Structures are given as C-alpha cells and as structure tokens.
C-alpha cells in the first residue's frame, strides 16, 4: 500500500511503519478492549495475530472518537474520548506513537484495513496474492481518482506574501513551512470539497531527505535552501454519489448569523450567497456549472486554493480533460454543459420506448403479448455514443427488443415455418400499427447473425421522437428445436450446430439477463458507463470491436468495479479506464479464469459450491484446449456459468492483441508519466504491423448524422 514510518505532515503518505505495526501488537497482546480484555492471545498463530490488528484498526477509531492507551513498562484500555488526531498514548513513557500519523492519511489507513478485512473474511475466493503480492503504490493515478499539481509562485524563495503567511506562531506549531503549507492545502481543499470527496492526500513532489556532509540542510534546485520541494500535487478519492452536485449546500439561514455561517460566507466570499428551494428551506449555498470536459471538482479546487492559498497559484489537471474529450460529445441541446455522469440522453430513449410499449400491448393479436423486453445497449447504458434523435447513421441506432407471446401449442414444429410464422405476427404488428398510429414509420429487414437460420425477419420501427427500435419474436419452441437439430446432426456436424445454438442463446436468452443485471448494477457504479464507453472507443481505434462482441467489452470493463481489490472502486474516468488496461495487461487468460460477481457493493453472490463448479469448468476446457487456440478469454458469471457464451469465435491473433496492446500501454505509462503526449499515443493506431492496409472514404461525412 506504500505506507512507511516516515513523516506524513510533510505530505508523503506514511507514519504507520513496522514499529507502529508491532507496538500495536504488543499493546493489543496485553488488552486493547474497552473492558481492558485481551483481544490477542500469545498462543495465536501468525494469521490470527495479523487478523486481529487489521480488525482492530478497521473498526475502532483512534483519531476523532476514541483513543488507546497502554503501558510499555497496566492492561491496555480503549478510551471513548478522542484527541481529534491519531493517538496511541503510552502512559509509561508519556509518548504518543501516532504523532507523525496525519488525520487525512489515517482515514486511508482505516479504509485499507477494512477492505482487507472483508477480503480476509472472504471464503469463496483466495485473496493471498491481492493482500500481500500486489503493489498498488506503483502509479498514483491508479490509486487516486484525481491528481492536481499546484505550481506555487516564485519557485529563489517563495513570495513575500506566502512567506508572511507562515508567521511566527505557526513556526511553533509546524517547524517547517512544508509541514504548515501541506496542512494549509488540506484544510481549504477538504473544506471546499467536503462531501464531494472521501480521502485527500497532499504530496510535496521532489522532496529530498539526505544531503552531503559539507552542507547543513537539504538543498532543492527550486528551493534554494528555502523550501525542500519542487511542486505540490493534490490527490483525491472522489465520492461518485455527490461529486457532480451543482450546488454546495451549507448552513441554514437564521436571524443571527451563526459561526458555521460565518466560516461559510468568508471561505467562498463572493461565491457564497443565499438561495431558496422548492422545499422552502433558506440556506447559504454556492452554485457551480457542469461541463463535459472537466468535473465540478476542477473548478472548486482552483477557486478555493487561489482565494486562500495564493492568488498566483497555477492549478491544472489536463489528463482528466483529454479522457473527457475522447468520449464522443452528443449533438443534443446543452451537450457541452452536460456532465459525463448524466444519462439524460438515455432516459429520453426509454420514454419513447414506453410510448411504444403502451401501443403494442393494447393492440389485438391472435396471441396475447406475454411481455416486451428491451435488450439494447442504450437500455443498459453502454452505447459508445449517446442516443440522438434522428441520428440514424449511428450503428447502435436500431435498438434490439425481444417480443414474446403467450405459450401456444399451435407453433410450427419446423424451424423455417416457425420463423416465417414469427414474421407473420410481426407483419400484423406493422399493419394496424400503421393504421392506428400513422405517426410511427416501419420497415422490415433480414437478420443473419444466427448461422443457418435465414428466415429471421426483424421489424424496424422509426419512432416519432426520432429513435429506431428492432423487434424480434421469442417463443418456447424455438429453443428446443435447436436442441433437436444438434441431436439429429451428424457427429462431425454437432460441434457446428452447438455453435449456432450458442449464438442464439447469446441474443435471445442470455441477452435479456445481461441487461437486467448490468442496468441495475450500473447505478451505484456511476463511472462504469463512461469508462465502458471510453473503453469501447479504445477498442474501435485499434480495430478490435469487429471481433469482440459488445457484451465481452462490458464484462472485462466491469471487473475493476465488482472486484476492485486490491484497489478501490473507480471513481473517475481515467482511474477506471487505466484499471481496465492494467487488468488486461496482467491477465493470464490461459491459466487464470475471469469470473465476476455481478452484485451491488456490500443475495446473488457466488457461493462456494457455485465457485468450485465454475473452476471445474475452466480446468475441463483447458484440458482439451491447453494452448487456448479455440478459446482465449474465459468470462463467466451467474448469467453465464459455462464461461464461453460471449468469448467464443474470437481469433487467437486478436485475443493476443488485447493483452499485447494493454501490456505496452502499461509499459508506456511506466517509462513516461501520464501526460498529454502519452494519452494521444494510447488512442492512435499504429497500423504498420498489419500485412496490408486498405483505406476507404464514404461519399458523405457521417459524423453529423451520427449525432456527434
């Protein structure tokens, strides 16, 4: 986790080292409870000793409410009172061992122990490698959602104003300006953002600790013996639920202006003011503007730091901005001002579907409608480009929907008659829809996705609000007829027929389930929709979507969310996307299966019996296919226990590209830090390794008609 015994007030994350780790053991081995009872026993093994402290640190608070006291030279007892700072008092020595431990770092420590305790209690999956054999400290971006570098003025000494702010009183409190200035950034940044963030870290980049024998104090090239740092980097763990809130709520109005209101109005200054709402509450709040290129957090920190820290400070995070721009910008009203977390385009789509939903049901047909199920990408919030009215050049414009009727014994027993009978039902749905609702337009198209089933005809409805929907009919007899074909097929032809059945269930049966879970699972994972869209964009640039089915790109992209360990859940677009690339780089798909628990954050969780069954499946397939030529990616879940449903038919060359490109991208980030040039490389295709390359141009530009 990149935690050390070094000082943390300077800015580096640390303050909890081995001797903090050990002295917590010894303090716990002689007590630790509120009743001064032993929490750890001398007979415990290494596993139990480690588990106790991780549980002890995770749930008991040592900073705000509660502190622990022990006697080195007397049972350790947990006091309810807190000193508002991480404290482990030692009455024998009168020494607080967590003095170097900062408030902000402590919360990240408490979070890390808790999330490991959940993994430690986990019995379904082995977590040894994640707990101990996975370094999260390599990249700051992967650990921390947003990173902002602040360039302080006059950096061969800090400006007179900034030096003046240090003053004599704070030299007593904080011995070095680095200790004070780091504290100054945290308070204003923490107070300015408030609930928008979970954890904040301030790092003095380029700080040295060793200096030659000939010199009395450390010398920084920018510092000039004055300040031992090059620049300050502000790193955050954002809270997706309220990171994009337009207005920062504050204290309520009163006849006498309260102290919390006093600190409220002063901090944001002119940005502070008083507003009313529909509920009738009168509260001091400040209002920001949403943008499609940067989050609200960008504006708050820039204004907050400049007003309080230094008016000359330069605050910049371009890496966020490039990733935001790479996402296609829809051609709707106020698209630029729309946030990346806004699904307004998507809600408009299903409302139009709901209008059609009411129409189809009241319509009289020979067989009553069982249900109409939307199974589309925009219905699951994964379409690369957001839906746009009348933008029919978009590949995802015509959205598939499954129509099922009441079970009947009159369905044709032959495949072609069945499917032709389906078109007859759809042909009615077109007919009196045209008569009753003339504002809706319709036409028929053929589908060839299912091999050897050439009678499939789908009804395309052009909705008046400007959206296209594709309808295909589902019936119980359809599934068993495919099973009949496999049984009747010759032994040599059976592997071909089961492949046809595999694609059928991928569109009709498993497709319905995939939307139902992902659509519900998408909400609490607010940033999953942008990252999977940007992830899909990255595949398209490198000519990989043609072989990767849309659902596989979603299953690979959701892994950092459902399985964030050893990291946290992605809370920013770049952190999630780089996490997806990191996983693909280190994924050994020949010997390691991918299995996901498509569940909400802490039922439908995979149990031990289900877990071992899927593991048994992977071994059996790899026994027949060790090299993985036939199958490369084994992606499974409750929807797909077989694990081959959405990863079949991918050529081995392309499968290696996804890992090969992912590996080089990670290596590129290591060799050169995340910057504008690197990102532009990440999203441009080499196109040279291909044996022959053919260029094409369409007669007209399609960008405008694609809703971009």
């Amino acid at each position: 986790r990149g935690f050390s015994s070094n000082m943390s007030h300077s800015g580096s994350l640390g303050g909890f080292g081995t001797f903090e780790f050990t002295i917590l053991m010894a303090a716990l081995l002689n007590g630790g409870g509120i009743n001064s009872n032993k929490i750890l026993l001398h007979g415990f093994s290494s596993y139990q000793l480690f588990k106790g402290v991780i549980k002890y640190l995770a749930t008991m608070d040592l900073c705000h409410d509660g502190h622990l006291q022990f006697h080195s030279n007397p049972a350790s007892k947990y006091i309810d009172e807190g000193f508002q700072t991480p404290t482990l008092f030692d009455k024998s020595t009168k020494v607080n061992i967590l003095t170097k431990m900062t408030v902000s770092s402590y919360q990240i420590l408490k979070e890390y122990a808790g999330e490991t305790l959940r993994m430690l209690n986990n019995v379904v999956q082995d977590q040894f490698s994640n707990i101990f054999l996975t370094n999260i400290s390599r990249f700051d971006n992967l650990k921390y959602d947003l990173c902002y570098d602040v360039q302080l003025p006059l950096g061969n000494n800090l400006e007179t104003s900034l030096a003046a702010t240090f003053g004599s009183m704070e030299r007593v409190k904080f011995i070095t300006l680095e200790n004070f200035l780091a504290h100054k950034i945290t308070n204003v940044a923490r107070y300015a953002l408030g609930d928008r963030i979970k954890y904040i870290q301030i790092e003095m980049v380029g700080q040295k600790s060793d200096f030659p024998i000939t010199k009395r104090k450390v010398y920084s090239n920018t510092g000039g013996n004055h300040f031992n740092f090059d620049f300050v980097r502000v790193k955050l763990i954002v809270n997706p639920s309220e990171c994009d809130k337009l207005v920062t709520k504050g204290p309520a109005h009163s006849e006498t202006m309260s102290t919390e209101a006093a600190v409220f109005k002063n901090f944001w200054g002119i940005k502070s003011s008083l507003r009313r709402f529909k509920d009738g509450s009168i509260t001091h709040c400040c209002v920001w503007s949403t943008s499609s290129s940067e989050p609200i957090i960008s504006s708050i920190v820039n204004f907050a730091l400049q007003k309080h820290v230094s008016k000359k400070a330069q605050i910049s995070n371009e890496t966020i901005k490039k990733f935001h721009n790479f996402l296609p910008l829809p051609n709707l009203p106020s698209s630029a001002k729309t946030s990346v977390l806004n699904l307004s385009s998507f809600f408009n789509l299903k409302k139009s579907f709901d209008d059609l939903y009411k129409i189809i049901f009241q319509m009289k047909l020979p067989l009553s409608v069982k249900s109409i199920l939307p199974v589309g990408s925009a219905f699951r919030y994964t379409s690369l480009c957001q839906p746009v009215p009348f933008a029919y050049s978009d590949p995802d414009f015509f959205q598939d929907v499954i129509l099922e009727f009441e079970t009947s014994p009159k369905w044709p027993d032959e495949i072609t008659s069945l499917e032709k009978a389906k078109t007859a039902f759809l042909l009615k749905i077109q007919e009196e829809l045209s008569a009753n609702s003339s504002t809706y337009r319709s036409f028929f198209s053929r589908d060839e996705s299912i091999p050897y089933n050439l009678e499939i005809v789908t009804l395309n409805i052009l909705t008046p609000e400007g959206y296209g929907f594709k309808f295909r009919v589902l019936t119980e007899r359809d599934e068993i007829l495919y099973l009949r074909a496999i049984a009747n097929a010759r032994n040599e032809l059976k592997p071909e027929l089961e492949a046809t059945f595999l694609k059928f269930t991928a569109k009709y049966l498993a497709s319905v389930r995939h939307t139902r879970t992902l659509e519900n699972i998408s909400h609490s994972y607010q940033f999953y929709s942008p990252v999977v869209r940007l992830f899909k964009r990255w595949l398209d640039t490198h000519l990989l979507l043609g072989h990767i089915t849309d659902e596989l790109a979603e299953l690979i992209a959701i892994k950092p969310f459902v399985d964030p360990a050893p990291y946290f859940i992605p809370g920013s677009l770049e952190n999630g996307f780089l996490k997806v690339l990191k996983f693909i780089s280190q994924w050994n798909w020949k010997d390691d299966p991918l299995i996901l628990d498509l569940v909400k954050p802490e039922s439908e969780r995979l149990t031990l019996a289900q877990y071992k069954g899927i593991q048994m499946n992977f071994t059996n397939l790899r026994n027949s296919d060790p090299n993985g030529t036939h199958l490369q990616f084994f992606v499974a879940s409750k929807n797909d226990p077989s694990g081959i449903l959405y990863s079949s038919g991918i050529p081995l060359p392309i499968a290696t590209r996804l890992t090969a490109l992912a590996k080089v991208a990670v290596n590129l980030l290591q060799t050169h830090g995340l910057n504008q040039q690197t990102i532009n490389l990440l999203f441009t295709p080499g196109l040279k390794d291909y044996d022959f390359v053919v260029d094409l141009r369409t007669p007209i530009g399609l960008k405008s008609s694609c809703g971009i």
């Binding site: 093994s45 596993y47 082995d126 054999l133």
Partner: peptide, 25 residues
C-alpha cells in the same frame, strides 16, 4: 485455512534474508 497457512510459509521463505549477509555486516 490450511491453504492460507502454507501460503504464508512460502512468502516468508521467499523473502527471508540470506543469513550470510548478516555475518558480513
């Protein structure tokens, strides 16, 4: 639990210092 316990042991021996350098220092 036995799988974890053996996994603990493998990690200790892999990272365990070579005693020769202890004598050297």
């Amino acid at each position: 639990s036995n799988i974890f316990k053996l996994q603990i042991d493998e990690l200790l021996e892999q990272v365990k210092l070579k005693q020769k350098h202890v004598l050297k220092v």
